[PDB]
């Protein structure tokens, strides 16, 4: 048996989804609303130069080295009544990290050398607009080791511990500045992960570091 096509779409209005659903129906393509290991294609809404917004399905698509292509692949197939090749429609960048950083392409080409290789990452809550277990899954797909609690860090010279938090999500407390007192590990924002994934290249922590209290 061979792997089969399984799609999720992102950034589309319902009406656009319905057009794809009719599309998926005609050419017997599997189409789900939730992305899994079995999902092979991620279809993003882009501009004429194949630049999209950064969504959860966008990040997870890259993390899994899956094919991330533009919505224009569907509309063009309609226009010419054929099934043209998706690869021609791979998104080249996004509105945050660059219009032609070739992240998704590079992501496919480096699964033997994943960007978070040799790292132990703890996603220290809370989080907004992105479930914790999905973010944990994200770094897993990128070769990182997920750590549930701060005390669970491996102690060793070879281990590289990292604490990732989202300052926006904290509303009741200013607690993220005190984490350095509880453990021996760098503390950086969620944006470190997002940028690293989008470019599929491990960014320097310097700019993403969150100031601590000694």
């Amino acid at each position: 048996v061979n792997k089969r096509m399984s799609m999720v779409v992102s950034g589309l209005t319902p009406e656009e989804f319905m057009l794809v659903y009719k599309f998926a129906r005609k050419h017997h393509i599997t189409l789900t609303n939730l992305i899994t290991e079995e999902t092979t294609h991620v279809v993003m809404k882009t501009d004429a130069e194949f630049v999209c917004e950064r969504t959860l399905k966008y990040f997870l698509g890259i993390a899994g080295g899956k094919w991330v292509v533009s919505y224009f692949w569907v509309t063009q197939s309609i226009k010419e009544r054929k099934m043209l090749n998706e690869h021609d429609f791979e998104v080249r960048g996004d509105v945050v990290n660059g219009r032609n950083h070739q992240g998704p392409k590079r992501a496919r080409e480096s699964q033997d050398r994943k960007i978070f290789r040799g790292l132990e990452i703890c996603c220290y809550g809370p989080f907004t607009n992105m479930p914790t277990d999905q973010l944990e899954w994200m770094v897993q797909l990128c070769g990182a080791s997920v750590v549930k609690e701060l005390s669970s860090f491996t102690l060793g010279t070879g281990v590289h511990p990292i604490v990732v938090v989202q300052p926006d999500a904290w509303t009741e407390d200013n607690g993220f500045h005190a984490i350095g007192q509880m453990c021996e590990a760098p503390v950086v924002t969620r944006e470190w992960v997002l940028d690293s994934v989008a470019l599929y290249q491990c960014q320097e922590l310097d700019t993403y570091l969150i100031p601590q209290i000694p």
Partner: peptide
């Protein structure tokens, strides 16, 4: 009816 927009970052 309502369309929760997909969360964008």
């Amino acid at each position: 009816g309502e369309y929760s927009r997909s969360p964008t970052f």
